[PDB]
Amino acid sequence: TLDSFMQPFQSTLWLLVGLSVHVVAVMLYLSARILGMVWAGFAMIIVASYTANLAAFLVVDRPEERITGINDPRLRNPSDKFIYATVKQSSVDIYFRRQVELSTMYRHMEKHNYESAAEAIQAVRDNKLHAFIWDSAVLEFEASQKCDLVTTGELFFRSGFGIGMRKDSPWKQNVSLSILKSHENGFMEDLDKTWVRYQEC
Amino acid sequence: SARILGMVWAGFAMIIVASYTANLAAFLVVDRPEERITGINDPRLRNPSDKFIYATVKQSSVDIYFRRQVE
Amino acid sequence: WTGRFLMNLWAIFCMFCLSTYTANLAAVMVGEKIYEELSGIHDPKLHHPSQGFRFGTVRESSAEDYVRQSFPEMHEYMRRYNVPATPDGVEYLKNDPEKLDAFIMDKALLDYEVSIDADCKLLTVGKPFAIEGYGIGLPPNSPLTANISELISQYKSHGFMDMLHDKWYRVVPC
Amino acid sequence: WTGRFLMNLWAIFCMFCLSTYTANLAAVM
Amino acid sequence: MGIKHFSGLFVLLCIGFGLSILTTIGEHIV
C-alpha cells in the first residue's frame, strides 16, 4: 500500500527545497518582490512535479505475478529466481524426458530436486522455490488443508482415472454400464463435495 | 459562521480541483488509439462490421484462392 | 512558536492529503475488472432462488436432462427460460436489455461461441461439473462397429486431433 | 468589479494551464 | 530530467537574484 514515500528519494528534494528557502530568505534579507515571486513559482512547479512523480510511481505496481500456463515466457529459461522442482523418480520425470521440445526446461528440473512430497510442500513454505509440478487432486487437496498456498494455472496433459480390468474379463461391460448411469445421475458430484474439497480456506 | 463556511467552501473547491486534475491526467495518459491492422489473425480481421468494409477486385487470382479455405 | 508549528503542521497535512488523494485517484483510474462471480454448481446464487432470475438452458437438449432428475425441485424455475436453438440463445443474452443472465450448455459449443465475438463481453466461469462425451452413432450392429473404433483410436493417439483443434478453436485476444 | 473579474479569469486560466502542464508531465513519464 | 530541471531553475533563480541586487544597488545611488 501507500508506504514507500521515503523510498522515492524524497529526502534529496526536501533538502534542496530547504536550502533554496534558506537562500531566498538570505537574499531577501540582503528586489525582494522578484525573489519572492520566483520562490512562489518554484514552489508551485515543485508541487506539480512531486504530484506527477507520485502519480507515476503509483502507476507502477510490479503486477503480473504468479503464473499463467506451461508455455508462458517465464517457463522457458529459468535464471535463478524460479528454480522449480519436480519430484524425481515419478511419472513426471519420465514425461519430461520424452517431450523433445522441453529439453532446456528439463535440464533445470535436474537441478535441485526432491525425494518426497512432504519435504517439497514444506519447502514451499520455506520460501526458496517458487513453483511445483505434480498431479492435480493431490495439489488441490494439499492447498485446501494447509491453507498456505493457492492452486493456480491451467491444466495440461489430460487423462482419465479409469477402472482397470483384465482383457476380455467376464465383467467387461456391466461395470461400464453402471459407471455411466451413475456418472450422469449426480453421484460423482456428491462424492466430490463430500471428500475432495473442503471449506476451511 | 462566516469563517467556518468560508473554510469549508475553500476545502470543497480544492477537492474539486484535485479531482479534476486527477481525471485530466488519467485521460491524458489513457489516450492511445493507434493499433493499425496487423496480419491474418486479428480481432478486426476475424469478424465483420460496417466500419471495415474491405474489398478485392473480383474474379482475379486472390479471390479464387481466398474462397476455398473453409476455415 | 505556536503559530509556526500550527502552520507547519497544516501545510504538511495538506500536502500529504493531496498526495494521497492523487495516489488513490491514480489507482482508481489505472485498472478495473470485476464482472460477476459464480463459484460452481452448488452456489446458492442459482441453487437458492433469488426473486426470479433467468439462467436459461436449451429445451430437451443435452445438459438440461441432468438438472431434470438430479435436483428435482426447480424444473418449474427453468421452464419459461428455454429458447430453442443455441446461437440465438447466445445472442439472446448479449443484445441487451437483459433477457437471460446465465446459461447451461455443453462446454465445447460455449468455448467456441466466445471466441468469434471480439466484443469480448462473455467469458467461461466456474469449474466443470459432471461429464459427457461425444461420439458417432451407428445402426444396430453394423459390420463397421469396431473398425471405426480402432481407426479413430489410432487417429487420436497419433496426434491428429491437435491439427484440427488448432485449426478451428482459434483463441484471438480481444 | 472589473479588476476582480480580470483576476478571477487570470486565476482560472492559470489553473487550467497548470493542470495541462501536470498532465503533460505525467504523460511524458 | 527532474534533477536537471531543478538545477536549471535554481541557476536561473540565482542569476535573477544577483541581477536584481546589482540593479537595486545601482539605482540606490541613481
Numbering used by the authors:
A (entry chain C): 550 to 579, 628 to 798
B (entry chain A): 628 to 698
C (entry chain B): 740 to 913
D (entry chain D): 740 to 768
E (entry chain D): 926 to 955
Lines from the paper:
NMDARs are formed from two obligate GluN1 subunits and two of any GluN2(A-D) or GluN3(A-B) subunits. In these NMDARs, glycine binding to GluN3 promotes channel opening, whereas glycine binding to GluN1 triggers rapid desensitization.
We initiated our single-particle cryo-EM on GluN1a-3A NMDAR bound to a competitive antagonist, CNQX, to capture the inhibited state. Hence, our analysis demonstrated that the GluN1-3A NMDAR heterotetramer is arranged with subunits in a 1-3-1-3 pattern, confirming that diheteromeric GluN1-3A receptors assemble as a “dimer of heterodimers” similar to GluN2-containing receptors. As in other NMDAR, AMPA, and kainate receptors, we observe domain swapping between the ATD and LBD layers, and pseudo-fourfold symmetry in the central channel pore formed by the M3 helices. We observe prominent density, consistent with CNQX, in the glycine binding pocket of the GluN1a LBD. While CNQX has been previously shown to bind the isolated GluN3A LBD, we do not detect a discernible CNQX density within the ligand-binding pocket of the GluN3A LBD. This absence may be attributed to low occupancy or poor local resolution.
